[PDB]
């Protein structure tokens with residue numbers, strides 16, 4: 573058979589923090605440090621299908637913070653796509669797993685998930701996750 577009821581999930585790991593206004597965000601974050609964060613993501617969740625994860629893309633954003641005493645806001649992130657993720661609830665043989673994007677993202681990235689409807693500027697925890705469906709009704713298998 574084929575399971576045609578998997579989804580692709582766009583995932584993003586985020587560290588938002590403030591730095592002295594005289595500094596730059598690329599004194600604090602590197603492509604390499606963010607790629608190492610991607611390497612810590614759990615790649616064998618019960619909800620994971622075949623084909624693993626896309627190439628990770630590090631990003632570094634910087635803006636002066638109007639509300640801060642002379643600080644800049646840094647947003648250091650790494651994003652990748654989980655190609656094939658189960659839909660619904662999944663029983664692994666011993667217990668149930670919720671494969672909805674929120675619980676799945678929190679298990680795989682290990683940080684609190686926020687809907688894309690919530691902007692970075694309105695999020696006040698330092699470390700957090702994004703996850704949203706980028707493709708539905710994909711094969712669970714690599715064939």
Ligand SMILES: [Zn+2]
Pocket residue numbers: 573574575711712713714715
């Ligand atoms: Zn298939």
Ligand SMILES: [Zn+2]
Pocket residue numbers: 573574575576711712713714715
């Ligand atoms: Zn299949």
Ligand SMILES: [Zn+2]
Pocket residue numbers: 587601648
């Ligand atoms: Zn950091």
Ligand SMILES: [Zn+2]
Pocket residue numbers: 587600601648649
């Ligand atoms: Zn970072």
